[PDB]
């Protein structure tokens, strides 16, 4: 997925979408390519426990410091656990091995915090119709980069609150601007019709972030 994403991003960036003729960005919009999932909220407690996040469907996940994962489905009880070796187990909050008591308790804390505080990213978006989990993430001075198991890469910029949701399957990018307005574009159509320098710059940055993901797999 990452290699495909890199090729898609390289292709759009090489077309110099903001540096040519009349920009027809609107013609690159494709609402059918809207993502099914993205990260609506996140909490970095990696100093001790890990990275907690909420997906737009109100499900929650934690990527713990020991590289294990716990995912709570939006029914508020069903759980999936993923061990280091990749083994996937299914359980509930009420019915679980005693060995998972601490991790389940931690997820509860993350969940409650993200239910009580913080804004839902993409709240105004209608998602497209087995949950993806957080494969890996990292932060830079300017952004947090979240790589989902379905191939999607989300980049949230800290300073201006703008966001990209990249999907290599749709070969598309969803851009959320400073006003929380959103558009989904087909990357090949951005090559065809161009885009503003703001989106173009963020796509150049996205390529460098994908390079980091690929070189640190």
């Amino acid at each position: 997925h990452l290699s495909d994403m890199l090729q898609q991003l390289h292709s759009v960036n090489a077309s110099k979408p903001s540096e040519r003729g009349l920009v027809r960005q609107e013609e690159a919009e494709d609402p059918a390519c809207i993502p099914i999932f993205w990260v609506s909220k996140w909490v970095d407690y990696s100093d001790k426990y890990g990275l907690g996040y909420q997906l737009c469907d109100n499900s929650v996940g934690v990527l713990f410091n020991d590289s294990t994962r716990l995912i709570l489905y939006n029914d508020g009880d069903s759980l999936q656990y993923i061990e280091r070796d990749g083994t996937e187990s299914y359980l509930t909050v009420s019915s679980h091995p005693n060995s998972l008591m601490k991790k389940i308790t931690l997820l509860k804390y993350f969940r409650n915090y993200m239910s009580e505080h913080l804004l839902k990213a993409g709240a105004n978006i209608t998602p497209r119709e087995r949950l993806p989990y957080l494969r890996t993430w990292f932060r830079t001075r300017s952004a947090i980069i979240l790589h989902l198991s379905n191939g999607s890469v989300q980049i949230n910029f800290f300073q201006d609150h703008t966001k990209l949701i990249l999907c290599p399957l749709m070969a598309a990018v969803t851009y959320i601007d400073e006003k929380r307005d959103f558009r989904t574009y087909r990357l090949s159509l951005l090559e065809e019709y161009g885009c503003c320098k703001e989106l173009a710059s963020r796509l150049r940055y996205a390529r460098t972030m994908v390079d980091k993901l690929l070189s640190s797999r």
């Binding site: 990260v39 909220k41 996140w42 909490v43 970095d44 407690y45 505080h117 913080l118 804004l119 990213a121 949230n156 800290f158 609150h161």
Partner: peptide, 5 residues
Amino acid sequence: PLHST
């Protein structure tokens, strides 16, 4: 930031 908006 240690958490989202």
